[PDB]
Amino acid sequence: SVRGANPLMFRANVLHMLLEFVLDNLYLNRHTGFSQDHTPFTEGANLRS
Amino acid sequence: SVRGANPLMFRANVLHMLLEFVLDNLYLNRHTGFSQDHTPFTEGANLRS
After folding, report:
1. Residue span of the signal peptide, if any (chains A, B) (predicted)?
2. I need a labelling partner for A34 at 20 to 30 A (CA). Which of A3, A8, A22, B7 fits?
């Protein structure tokens, strides 16, 4: 079949899914640069661009 | 007659038949290889092939 999965292995599939979810987010955040704002609702708040 | 047999020799014929039976069933048992059951018919038993 192509539109069906084996219910006897949902746990193995979910464990592999969670492993990949973790492995995909192994990055270090980067510091880019900001921009001072003067919109009437974000007065003088440095925003990241 | 092609469809007749002498009754006074059933014992000899049956002794020879039993001897051939035993001589035929003189083998050892190979270990082939198994396979997990991916369906819910059994409790995940291992099946020969």
Report:
1. none
2. A22
Q: Which approach determined this entry?
A: cryo-EM
Tokens matching residue A12: 């193995």
Q: Please tell me the distance from the alpha carbon of residue B22 to that of residue B42, in angstroms, as a whole number.
A: 35
The DSSP element (H or E) to which A12 belongs, if any, is: helix A10-24
Helix, strand, coil shares of chain A, percent, nearest 5, are 35, 10, 55
- Minimal C-alpha gap between A1 and chain B (Å): 15
Is A8 an 8 Å CB contact of chain B? yes
Is B40 close to A8, i.e. CB distance below 8 A? yes
Query: How far apart are the C-alpha atoms of B46 and B38, rounded to whole Å?
Result: 10
